[PDB]
Amino acid sequence: YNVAQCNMTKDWFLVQMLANYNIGYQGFYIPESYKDRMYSFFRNFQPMSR
């Protein structure tokens, strides 16, 4: 049940993308450019591994 390339689960992942913006249950869409106006959810977020 882990979200892509991190131990962060599906249980928490779907909270933030739906909490602020209208994408999540309606299938799976990519966020719009105007929405993430300077570090809103994804601009700071880039998951990594070593």
Partner: protein, 69 residues
Amino acid sequence: STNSFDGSIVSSYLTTRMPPWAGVRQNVMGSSIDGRPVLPANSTTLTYETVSGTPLETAASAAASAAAA
């Protein structure tokens, strides 16, 4: 040098709910089955994906059937 007096008061600080998920109470060093390693309750290695897994044997043989041009 002295840090705390004999006869410390305990029942002052209020006790409540406890999340029963892995290692919430004591820094137990719980070992694992034949494959996985050991992790303590309060470690900074616990925050990552400390995972065990590699089969390889099929990869070296399947590529070798090209030998003849």
